[PDB]
Q: What sequence folds into this?
């Protein structure tokens, strides 16, 4: 209905450049003011820029003045944030927000996001190690099993257990930067019987490097 | 720049109770006859959701359990009664004056009753070793309150370096948290030792809950 | 500056007489 | 009886700027004679008209012929705040008044050798468009072309053409573009003129006025 | 204005207006209302360092439609517009080539129906008009105005001077004049009235002066 | 007295038409320069405040009457009840100036401190409306600003705008008027 889908995210080396687009639908874009807000890793939200009312009077906070430009194309309903001199501080998830309607009333209707990963680091694939238990842990009735994904870049990896099936007591923990390249673990609890007799498999997908990796959990 | 300061930064609250959230601006946020203070709800993986929008008035149709008040500098969200469909990080933000500052958020989580952690320790896989390394990962799952303290031991000797920890946000179902603990060693100093121990201490016990393997029993 | 419930100094001030302090 | 007076409230408060004069105490003092001391000045703006100071382009007062052809040698904001002014007397002065009106003079002294010849153009781009990067687009504004010769210097006046009768010396945060346009100076061509310096200065114009003194600065 | 022959059953009070090579005759005038003055202030101010010029060519008629008056729309129904709006031709060209400019307006609004209609419109020009309340439509007569009433006239004519806190403007972001037309007596149609009335405007920018030639790409 | 109504040309009949006799008036009180030449409270919110006449209450005589015009000119007189040093700064001055004392700063002498200030905008006149910052008389700052009043001197008004009263509930708007004690 109102609709803000942004596009253009990526992995970029420091000092580099990207241009995002906020493609719009379901409202008269050419007559509304527009904003970009980002969300940093440590989950805090910074406003990025505001463009005026389908024409220009552009506004920016200090961190971005000089480096970032907000521009809009009323002819084909697309908002842009061109970004030059990507400082690593700029690794955030970027959102296209419709800024204005009858008045000043918050930022209602927010897009969905594109991530930027400024790292010199470039695309590394994920190492997935089955976390099966030692001999001394198969006991009681439920039995927890795990998946160790290591040092990959950019984020994300999607861990799935059994192509969908064990969507039940599976905990997948937040990614962390061991050294500018991520680790990520996922555990599933299973009835002991189910394993070892039935194959628990870990489905690891890393969009960015065109990797899917499936590791079986085989015991001892 | 106006600075907003939210209090508390995480609160645990029982269902049906009242959670209040204050947000202080360092200098007036009212212009004209309007406070330009806004409150948002961020569920994991959602875009933020506008909730309240000039300190008191609600958006669209978000539940009336939700209200706001405040003039100038002192603003509050009140959720009364808290349902489980409210676990999230809440933010206030101002629109009076560029640069459009944003408060720190407050992660609201659910007091559940206390639940102690299930503790799993995993060796390194034979292949992580083959590539020259070893992570010993511990899992401490489904517990409440989120303040727990895990420890590493290796042959009794304590261990501090190379422990990477991460916590799952509150779970919507059973308002517990979980987390992993990973000691990463090199393959050579890892083989230089025999018992490894994830020792976790959390308020539901007098004992540390300890878990350990012993490379002779592999 | 259009009509408007906003403030002079705010990204909407270019619509305020209403309150862009009336008059630039 | 004596003379009945009403001591009005809200009257009498000190005031750092009042037009009165304090009572005295030490009198009958005679100053040494200072008849005809050289270099007296009566109003700042006189010296400002008489002595043009230099503009700045990254640590230097001149502009350098990059290479032969249609190059845009410089372009800047028409505000006394402008980066290019900065070291300029005019700006150092204007910093104490809120408003102004008037003509500003630009001076271009070619420093090249006798075998170095060039031709330049200078224009005043009023706001409403974006400062053109090439003469043919700028040729439509108030401009002036001129070549090198015996006369090293060339002066040119920057016209006060604004909506209001006065304008601010100061620059507001909300202003993205220089409220008063820009002045771009090009080169049309040259020969053996590359490397050579065209040092520029600016002086106050005849009808240039500064008004409304203000003290905004640190202490 | 007046006409001869004698008396008659038709119309008289003839008047021809002319700006540039454009005329506009009207056998049913009611005179012409004059602005807030008879002559504009000094056209050559200090704010223009006297680099201003005037263009005779711009001062000509240009037409632009308003709306259709129908019995439905009753009291207070109003149609406003800010002059120039989208400007074409010579006049338009000026706006694209000069930074600042100024001019007044020669407005001739013509609601051609037929003498058997009842009803009545009020046409005015307003300085810095920023949304009137319902109540203050009643005090619209404080502005240069003129009524159109079918039993009497077909055309309303008002001439007005340039105004503003500035001797010269940047039309591209401030125009002072706003031409409005409001229904005061809803349109009557009776037996032989006209079903509905088409309302147009014949305008001329008066005494157009421009200053500060801009750069150009075409 | 029949007229062509459409004309818009003013018409003013008199009691003489039926036999009456129009008298004399002294509209001193309805004189622009005069009515506006009085103090009006303006709602100050901080300990620093930009001087603007549009801030008078829209239903207050002065503000109601000022808004009954579209363009205006005038000098100012101000009465501030403040604490510490009161500093004024001219239109277009960097806000940072309010702290500097070499600017027109008045020391305390309670209760109020009264000053006469020059119209200081850069336009030929200011406005009540506008169909698009500078529309001010400068700004004031004092450690404490308890109350603020302003007075328009030398007022000039151009182009009248409307001015409405109260919409009565019934046939007329009745209310309590100053009367003597009953006894």
A:
């Amino acid at each position: 209905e109102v609709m803000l889908v942004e596009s253009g995210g990526g992995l970029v080396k420091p000092g580099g450049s990207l241009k995002l687009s906020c493609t719009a639908s379901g409202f008269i874009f050419n007559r509304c003011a527009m904003s970009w807000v980002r969300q940093t890793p440590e989950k805090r939200l910074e406003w990025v820029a505001t463009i005026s009312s389908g024409g220009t009077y552009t506004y920016y906070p200090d961190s971005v003045k000089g480096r970032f430009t907000i521009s809009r194309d009323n002819a084909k309903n697309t908002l842009y944030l061109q970004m030059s001199s990507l400082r690593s501080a700029d690794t955030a998830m970027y959102y296209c927000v419709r800024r204005e309607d009858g008045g000043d009333e918050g930022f209602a209707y927010w897009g969905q996001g594109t991530v930027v990963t400024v790292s010199a680091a470039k695309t590394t694939p994920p190492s997935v190690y089955p976390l099966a238990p030692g001999s001394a842990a198969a006991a009681a009735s439920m039995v927890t099993l795990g998946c160790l994904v290591k040092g990959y870049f950019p984020e994300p990896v999607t861990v799935t257990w059994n192509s969908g099936s064990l969507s039940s007591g599976v905990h997948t923990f937040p990614a962390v930067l061991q050294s500018d390249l991520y680790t990520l673990s996922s555990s599933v609890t299973v009835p002991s019987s189910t394993w070892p007799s039935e194959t628990v498999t870990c489905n690891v997908a890393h969009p960015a490097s065109s990797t899917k990796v499936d590791k079986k959990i085989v015991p001892r | 720049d106006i600075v907003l300061t939210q209090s508390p930064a995480s609160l645990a609250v029982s269902l049906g109770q009242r959670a209040t959230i204050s947000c202080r601006a360092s200098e007036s946020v009212d212009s004209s006859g309007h406070s330009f203070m806004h409150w948002y709800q961020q569920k994991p993986g959602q875009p933020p959701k506008l909730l309240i929008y000039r300190a008191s008035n609600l958006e669209s149709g978000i539940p009336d359990r939700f209200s706001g008040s405040g003039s100038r500098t002192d603003f509050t969200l009140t959720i009364d009664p808290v349902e489980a469909d409210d676990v999230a990080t809440y933010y206030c933000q101002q629109s009076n004056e560029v640069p459009l500052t944003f408060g720190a958020g407050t992660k609201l989580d659910l007091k559940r009753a206390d639940a102690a952690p299930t503790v799993s320790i995993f060796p390194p896989s034979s292949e992580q070793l083959t590539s020259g390394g070893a992570s010993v990962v511990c899992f401490l799952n489904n517990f409440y309150p989120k303040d727990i303290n895990v420890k590493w031991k290796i042959d009794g000797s304590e261990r501090q370096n190379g422990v990477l920890n991460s916590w799952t946000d509150q779970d919507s179902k059973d308002s517990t948290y979980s987390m992993s603990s990973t000691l990463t060693l090199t393959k050579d100093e890892y083989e230089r030792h025999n018992s490894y121990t994830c020792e976790a201490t959390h308020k539901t016990s007098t004992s540390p809950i300890v878990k350990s393997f012993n490379r002779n029993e592999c | 500056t259009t009509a408007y419930t906003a403030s002079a100094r705010g990204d909407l001030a270019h619509l305020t007489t209403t309150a862009a302090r009336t008059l630039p | 009886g004596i003379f009945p007076v009403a001591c009005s409230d809200g009257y009498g408060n000190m005031v750092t700027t009042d037009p009165k004069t304090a009572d005295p105490a030490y009198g009958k003092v005679y100053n040494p004679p200072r008849t005809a001391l050289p270099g007296r000045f009566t109003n700042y703006l006189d010296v400002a008209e008489a002595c043009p100071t230099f503009l700045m382009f990254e640590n230097v007062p001149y502009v350098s012929t990059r290479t032969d052809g249609q190059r845009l040698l410089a372009k800047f904001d028409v505000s006394l705040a402008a980066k290019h002014m900065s070291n300029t007397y005019l700006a150092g002065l204007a910093q104490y008044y809120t408003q102004y009106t008037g003509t500003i003079n630009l001076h271009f002294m070619f420093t090249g050798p006798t075998d170095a010849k060039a031709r330049y153009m200078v224009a005043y781009v009023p706001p409403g468009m974006d400062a053109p990067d090439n003469p043919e687009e700028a040729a439509h504004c108030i401009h002036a072309e001129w070549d090198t010769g015996l006369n090293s210097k060339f002066t040119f006046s920057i016209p006060y053409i604004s909506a209001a009768d006065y304008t601010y010396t100061a620059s507001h945060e909300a202003e993205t573009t220089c409220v008063q346009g820009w002045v771009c100076v090009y080169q049309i061509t040259h020969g053996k003129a590359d490397a050579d310096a065209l040092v520029v200065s600016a002086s106050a114009g005849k009808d240039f006025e500064l008004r409304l003194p203000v003290d905004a600065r640190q202490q | 204005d007046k006409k001869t022959e004698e008396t008659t059953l038709l119309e008289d009070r003839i008047l021809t207006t002319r700006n540039g090579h454009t005329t506009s005759t009207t056998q049913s005038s009611v005179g012409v209302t004059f602005g807030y003055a008879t002559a504009e202030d000094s056209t050559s101010g200090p704010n223009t360092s006297a680099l201003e010029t005037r263009v005779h060519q711009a001062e000509r008629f240009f037409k632009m439609a308003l709306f259709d008056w129908v019995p439905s729309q009753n009291f207070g129904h109003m149609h406003k517009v800010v002059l120039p709006h989208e400007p074409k031709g010579v006049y338009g060209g000026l706006v694209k080539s000069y930074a600042y400019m100024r001019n007044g307006w020669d407005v001739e609004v013509t609601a051609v129906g037929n003498q058997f209609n009842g009803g009545c419109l009020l046409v005015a020009l307003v300085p810095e008009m920023g949304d009137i309340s319902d109540r203050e439509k009643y005090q619209l007569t404080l502005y240069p105005h003129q009524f159109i009433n079918p039993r009497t006239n077909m055309t309303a004519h008002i001439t007005v001077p340039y105004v503003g806190v500035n001797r010269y403007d940047q039309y591209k972001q401030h125009r002072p004049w706003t031409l409005v037309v409001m229904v005061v007596a809803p349109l009557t149609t009776n037996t032989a009235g006209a079903q509905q009335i088409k309302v147009y405007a014949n305008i001329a920018p008066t005494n157009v002066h421009v200053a500060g030639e801009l750069p150009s790409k075409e | 007295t029949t007229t062509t109504g459409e004309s818009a040309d003013p018409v003013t009949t008199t009691v003489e038409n039926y036999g009456g006799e129009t008298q004399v008036q002294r509209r001193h009180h309805t004189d622009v320069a005069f009515v506006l030449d009085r103090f009006v409270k303006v709602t100050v919110s901080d300990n620093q405040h930009t001087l603007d006449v549009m801030q008078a209450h829209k239903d207050n005589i002065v503000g109601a009457l000022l808004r009954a015009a579209t363009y205006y000119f005038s000098d100012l007189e101000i009465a501030v009840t403040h604490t510490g040093k009161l500093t004024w700064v001219p239109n277009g001055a960097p806000v940072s100036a309010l702290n500097n004392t070499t600017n027109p700063t008045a020391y305390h002498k309670g209760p109020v401190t009264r000053l006469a200030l020059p119209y200081t905008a850069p336009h030929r006149v200011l406005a009540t409306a506008y169909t698009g910052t500078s529309f001010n008389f400068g700004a004031v700052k004092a450690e404490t600003i308890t109350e603020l009043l302003v007075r328009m001197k030398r007022a000039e008004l151009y182009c009248p705008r409307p001015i409405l009263p109260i919409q009565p509930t019934g046939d007329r708007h009745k209310q309590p008027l100053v009367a003597p004690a009953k006894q």
